[PDB]
Amino acid sequence: GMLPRLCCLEKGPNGYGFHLHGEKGKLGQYIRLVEPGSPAEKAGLLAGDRLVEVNGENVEKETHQQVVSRIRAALNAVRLLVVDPEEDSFL
Numbered sequence: 001g002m003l004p005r006l007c008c009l010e011k012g013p014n015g016y017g018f019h020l021h022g023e024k025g026k027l028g029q030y031i032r033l034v035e036p037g038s039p040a041e042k043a044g045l046l047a048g049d050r051l052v053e054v055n056g057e058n059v060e061k062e063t064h065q066q067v068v069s070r071i072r073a074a075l076n077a078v079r080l081l082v083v084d085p086e087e088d089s090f091l
């Protein structure tokens with residue numbers, strides 16, 4: 001609706017099933033390569049999505065390493081708050 005899409009994935013045997021990546025100069029992390037049939041795909045993630053929060057914490061301006069660390073440390077699940085970058089901007 002109005003709220004950013006919230007994607008709640010349960011960690012599977014083969015991880016979550018998606019890549020995360022930044023872009024030189026333009027800080028920020030983005031979903032990339034979502035595997036068919038994975039938690040990521042089941043939870044609604046889409047390559048192209050920008051990652052705003054991981055488990056209720058703002059990671060919009062955090063390094064690639066910080067964000068991956070956070071995602072990786074959670075135990076069973078991660079809630080990923082994403083927006084479509086063509087429709088959302090931070091000010």
Ligand SMILES: [Cl-]
Pocket residue numbers: 031032033034047048
């Ligand atoms: Cl991709």
Ligand SMILES: [Cl-]
Pocket residue numbers: 004005082083084085087088
């Ligand atoms: Cl959005």
